[PDB]
Write a protein that binds this ligand. Structure first.
Ligand SMILES: [Mg+2]
Ligand SMILES: [Mg+2]
Ligand SMILES: [Mg+2]
Ligand SMILES: [Mg+2]
Ligand SMILES: [Mg+2]
Ligand SMILES: [Mg+2]
Ligand SMILES: [Mg+2]
Ligand SMILES: [Mg+2]
Ligand SMILES: [Mg+2]
Ligand SMILES: [Mg+2]
Ligand SMILES: [Mg+2]
Ligand SMILES: [Mg+2]
Ligand SMILES: [Mg+2]
Ligand SMILES: [Mg+2]
Ligand SMILES: [Mg+2]
Ligand SMILES: [Mg+2]
Ligand SMILES: [Mg+2]
Ligand SMILES: [Mg+2]
Ligand SMILES: [Mg+2]
Ligand SMILES: [Mg+2]
Ligand SMILES: [Mg+2]
Ligand SMILES: [Mg+2]
Ligand SMILES: [Mg+2]
Ligand SMILES: [Mg+2]
Ligand SMILES: [Mg+2]
Ligand SMILES: [Mg+2]
Ligand SMILES: [Mg+2]
Ligand SMILES: [Mg+2]
Ligand SMILES: [Mg+2]
Ligand SMILES: [Mg+2]
Ligand SMILES: [Mg+2]
Ligand SMILES: [Mg+2]
Ligand SMILES: [Mg+2]
Ligand SMILES: [Mg+2]
Ligand SMILES: [Mg+2]
Ligand SMILES: [Mg+2]
Ligand SMILES: [Mg+2]
Ligand SMILES: [Mg+2]
Ligand SMILES: [Mg+2]
Ligand SMILES: [Mg+2]
Ligand SMILES: [Mg+2]
Ligand SMILES: [Mg+2]
Ligand SMILES: [Mg+2]
Ligand SMILES: [Mg+2]
Ligand SMILES: [Mg+2]
Ligand SMILES: [Mg+2]
Ligand SMILES: [Mg+2]
Ligand SMILES: [Mg+2]
Ligand SMILES: [Mg+2]
Ligand SMILES: [Mg+2]
Ligand SMILES: [Mg+2]
Ligand SMILES: [Mg+2]
Ligand SMILES: [Mg+2]
Ligand SMILES: [Mg+2]
Lengths: 271, 93, 46
RNA sequence: AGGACCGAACCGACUAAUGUUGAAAAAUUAGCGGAUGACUUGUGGCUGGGGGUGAAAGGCCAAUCAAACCGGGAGAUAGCU
RNA sequence: GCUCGCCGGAAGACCAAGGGUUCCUGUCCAACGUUAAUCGGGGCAGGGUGAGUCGACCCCUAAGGCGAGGCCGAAAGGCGUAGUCGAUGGGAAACAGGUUAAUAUUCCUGUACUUGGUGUUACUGCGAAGGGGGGACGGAGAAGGCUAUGUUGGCCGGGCGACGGUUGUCCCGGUUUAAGCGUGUAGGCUGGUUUUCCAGGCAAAUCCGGAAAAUCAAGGCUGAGGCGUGAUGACGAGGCACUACGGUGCUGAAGCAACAAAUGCCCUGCUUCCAGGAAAAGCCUCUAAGCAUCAGGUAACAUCAAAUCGUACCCCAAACCGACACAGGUGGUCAGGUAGAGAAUACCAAGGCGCUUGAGAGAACUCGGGUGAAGGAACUAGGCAAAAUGGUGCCGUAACUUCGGGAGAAGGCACGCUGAUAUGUAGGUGAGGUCCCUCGCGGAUGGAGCUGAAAUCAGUCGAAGAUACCAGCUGGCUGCAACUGUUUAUUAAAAACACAGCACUGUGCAAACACGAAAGUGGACGUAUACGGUGUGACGCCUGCCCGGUGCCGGAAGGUUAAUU
């Protein structure tokens, strides 16, 4: 649910939280965990290559099965869990054969529900089938680019993909961005949407909350000197130039996609 | 079992001082100058061979040489090794 | 007040030591130059 | 509960006086701000000079910064003193 | 040596880092020490650092580094796999007393513990470069049980007081004891157990995970402290004798109890919150190959080993960083008494110091302070500076407000000491004695003793009772910035930066973008409820007209046009 805090202090007045009483409160499943230390936007050269990244809370990586390649064996939702690494919630499923896996938790899937993957799985939320066997018009998430590669589309909270058409070896997908993209029919998908749709109603409320998520402050280019931004300079507040990136590229409307390898797979750009 | 040449080489000289004397009268302990590369087992064996006494335990420390001056010139002495060996309360050396 | 030299033997050795010098050909150029001049102390090691 | 309140440690540095061949190449004394947080601190590590880093002052990068330091081109050039 | 003063959350004590003989003894005063120096961190010489348990080394990993092959690159080199290094983290084990001029958890005394190796015996499925478990982890908050420690009473030794009094409801001092072992308590968590079945754990597995019956319902893991022992012990005021007047030798009484109580322990616990909280080894366990009347595993005993290196001394400082014996800087640990909420503050204890020129005088003037007639901001750029306020409990408190605030608004009253209530109250603690039982660190009853607020009433001293130190000035109107934060280290702290929020725009994932001649890497083990760039800057009401100029987006008819031919 979505609850706003009482204004008992200036840093609390505008905080809007998303509360989920259903999420598990204990520690996550230990054998499905890994460490991932923070980079702070630095690459192997040690240079900042993405700005505004640093700090935040320590996080453990939950190994999430994006492929869903356990065909036939039924599985039951043991619980729903909080994952720091992504905006979506995850679910711990127990397979009939005794194996436990983390999956992306779809909308509406509670504890005790049955899920199944494969051609023989039914048309039910949380079930993973080839898009060849998924009917036209269905709403899916965790969509594959290439067969066997794993879901790479519609993975964040409240996101889904609709199957608009099927012609031969390819189905058409209307992506969340508004783009029409062609995908091989053998690529898998999971029925239903991604849960936690009310993720985007949260209001951070204060600067520190954004600092907790490892986001460092952004400085406007017009607030600095010309030696370190094209926007720099001026006695007082002056702009008089076309807005650009810190590296001189026009940053309002100039298209930057240039990939001739994959233009054939785009039916229609998002526009 | 240590070669006899090594044993004849590991004992340098006996240390004489008020502390060495008091150890000798009270705790039946002789204090010796030994090679910088001498171990406790070698000290024990050499004292049992060349002194004909019986040892029960060896204690070792390394003394650092002093920085001195000779005619307004910097100069330093060598870091040597000192051993306390406890004799078995009947040896009388 | 806090001055610029805050000594640490480990960091001194890792930045300017003999093995740190020998790790690169430019450090070896440093050693070669200091040998040619006749320096009694090639590195911070001793 | 809280980038909540008063207030020591701790981190700072708003006012005044002193000091200005100082006790000190930035401090002392009396007041002052924060003090569970975007806090502070130890140890070790990474980013290198038209480069780094910068909650952005052209700030900081070993008392040096609108282009560090050391060596070299080099006895640069100087219609100037 | 006797007085005086200063610190005492330090200006005491013990470490780490850093330094390197500055430590101790003798000797000297040339130079060094801001003066003298017989003194010294100065000169010179001699001495001093004792470990199976502390630390390193060692085993294991983090960030990161290096990196056989490999990929890439004019050369130099870059990156990176397998590996191998890398603590600031994980991993076995010792306490108390005594002792030197200088070392001690290292030496001695007493009493312990760990690991490993060999051999004898007994039983016996062992075996990993593999599987599983464990190690193993956040913030805040609350309570109970304790201890460290303190106070008092009892007891034991001593005293009867320089000047009125002091055989007492008097004064002074002591009243200490460890690890280890045994006990398994206050407390925390977990339902046991036996069979059978199995797409899972790369192969297997009795191990782990999953499923199903039966049966029991009590078993297991963890755990401060207390008690017993350790301990007929050591220690202990005091006393007796030597003294080289520094100290040496001998003995040694009591050595109990109650109350108070931590920020330390139970506690890596419990509760709750979101921002969701290392790794790997040691350790347990299982099998694979292999070995299978041998090896190998378990237990008893015995013996042997535990190396090497560090250990002095300073360590908020005269020994480290600041050129100095420099009002500076420097991480961790201990934490007594009265008053106090307190690690504030004042005075003290333990302990440590009087800051390496002094002696006079008592001019102007400077600096740091105290007081001031009458006036009260008239000063001045400006109340700068100073003065002033200042605690606890209760009564009481406006506009406006985003309903939280404003607010400690403003303002006001009481406050000491003594007696009574009540020879010490409410409460807290809590023995005996007794009673019950699965008999013990049990339950129930009980209340001796100890401890002890707050209040009312009466009385009483002073000019003054929040009496010292300590410790908000208050109110009104208005600009700017929503707010907490950040910044010109060293003349600017702000209205500047950031901010939560908003909008535009890019980006379909081998993403855009960034660092890289490249390989690669970050973005991100993320996937449009995501990520980058730009502008604006909580919130409320809102954001109007212009596409001519210049950008950017879309288009492709007609003109122009490169290499080419
Ligand atoms: Mg950004
Ligand atoms: Mg922004
Ligand atoms: Mg500016
Ligand atoms: Mg420019
Ligand atoms: Mg202007
Ligand atoms: Mg203009
Ligand atoms: Mg606060
Ligand atoms: Mg600052
Ligand atoms: Mg200033
Ligand atoms: Mg101050
Ligand atoms: Mg405040
Ligand atoms: Mg405060
Ligand atoms: Mg400027
Ligand atoms: Mg500088
Ligand atoms: Mg230049
Ligand atoms: Mg030239
Ligand atoms: Mg010249
Ligand atoms: Mg004090
Ligand atoms: Mg000396
Ligand atoms: Mg002199
Ligand atoms: Mg003289
Ligand atoms: Mg001395
Ligand atoms: Mg001396
Ligand atoms: Mg040793
Ligand atoms: Mg020993
Ligand atoms: Mg190679
Ligand atoms: Mg490499
Ligand atoms: Mg290693
Ligand atoms: Mg370490
Ligand atoms: Mg000592
Ligand atoms: Mg006690
Ligand atoms: Mg505390
Ligand atoms: Mg010592
Ligand atoms: Mg001095
Ligand atoms: Mg000083
Ligand atoms: Mg400090
Ligand atoms: Mg002086
Ligand atoms: Mg005077
Ligand atoms: Mg005056
Ligand atoms: Mg006055
Ligand atoms: Mg007056
Ligand atoms: Mg008057
Ligand atoms: Mg008046
Ligand atoms: Mg006036
Ligand atoms: Mg005037
Ligand atoms: Mg003032
Ligand atoms: Mg004042
Ligand atoms: Mg105005
Ligand atoms: Mg502001
Ligand atoms: Mg400044
Ligand atoms: Mg990539
Ligand atoms: Mg602005
Ligand atoms: Mg407009
Ligand atoms: Mg054309």
């Amino acid at each position: 649910a979505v609850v706003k805090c009482k204004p008992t202090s200036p840093g609390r007045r505008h905080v809007v939280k998303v509360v989920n009483p259903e999420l598990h409160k204990g520690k996550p499943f230990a054998p499905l965990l890994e460490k991932n230390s923070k980079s702070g936007g630095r690459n192997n050269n040690g240079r900042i290559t993405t700005r505004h990244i640093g700090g935040g809370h320590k996080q453990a990586y939950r190994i999430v099965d994006f492929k869903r390649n356990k065909d036939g064996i039924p599985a039951v939702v043991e619980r729903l869990e909080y994952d720091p690494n992504r905006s979506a919630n995850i679910a711990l499923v127990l397979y009939k054969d005794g194996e436990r896996r983390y999956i992306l938790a779809p909308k509406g899937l509670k504890a005790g529900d049955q899920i199944q993957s494969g051609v023989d799985a039914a048309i039910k939320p949380g079930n993973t089938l080839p898009m060849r066997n998924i009917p036209v018009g269905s709403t899916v998430h965790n969509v594959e680019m290439k067969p066997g590669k794993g879901g790479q589309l519609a993975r964040s909270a409240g996101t889904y993909v609709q199957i608009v058409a099927r012609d031969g070896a390819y189905v058409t997908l209307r992506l969340r961005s508004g783009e029409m993209r062609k995908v091989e029919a053998d690529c898998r998908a999971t029925l239903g949407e991604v849960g936690n749709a009310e993720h985007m109603l949260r209001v951070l409320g204060k600067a520190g909350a954004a600092r907790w998520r490892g986001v460092r402050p952004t400085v406007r280019g017009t607030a600095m000197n010309p030696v370190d931004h094209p926007h720099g300079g001026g006695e007082g507040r002056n702009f008089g130039k076309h807005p650009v990136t810190p590296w001189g590229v026009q940053t309002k409307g100039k298209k930057t996609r240039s990939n001739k390898r994959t233009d054939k797979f785009i039916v229609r750009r998002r526009s | 079992m240590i070669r006899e040449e090594r044993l004849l080489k590991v004992l340098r000289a006996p240390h004489v001082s008020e502390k060495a004397s008091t150890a000798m009268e009270k705790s039946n302990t002789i204090v010796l100058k030994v090679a910088k590369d001498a171990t406790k087992a070698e000290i024990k064996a050499a004292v049992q061979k060349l002194f004909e006494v019986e040892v029960e335990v060896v204690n070792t420390l390394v003394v650092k040489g002093k920085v001195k001056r000779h005619g307004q010139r910097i100069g330093r002495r060598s870091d040597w090794k000192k051993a306390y060996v406890t004799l078995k309360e009947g040896q009388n050396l | 007040m806090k001055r610029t030299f805050q000594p640490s033997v480990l960091k001194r050795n890792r930045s300017h030591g003999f093995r740190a010098r020998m790790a690169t050909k430019n450090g070896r150029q440093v050693l070669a130059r200091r040998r040619a001049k006749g320096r009694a102390r090639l590195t911070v090691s001793k």
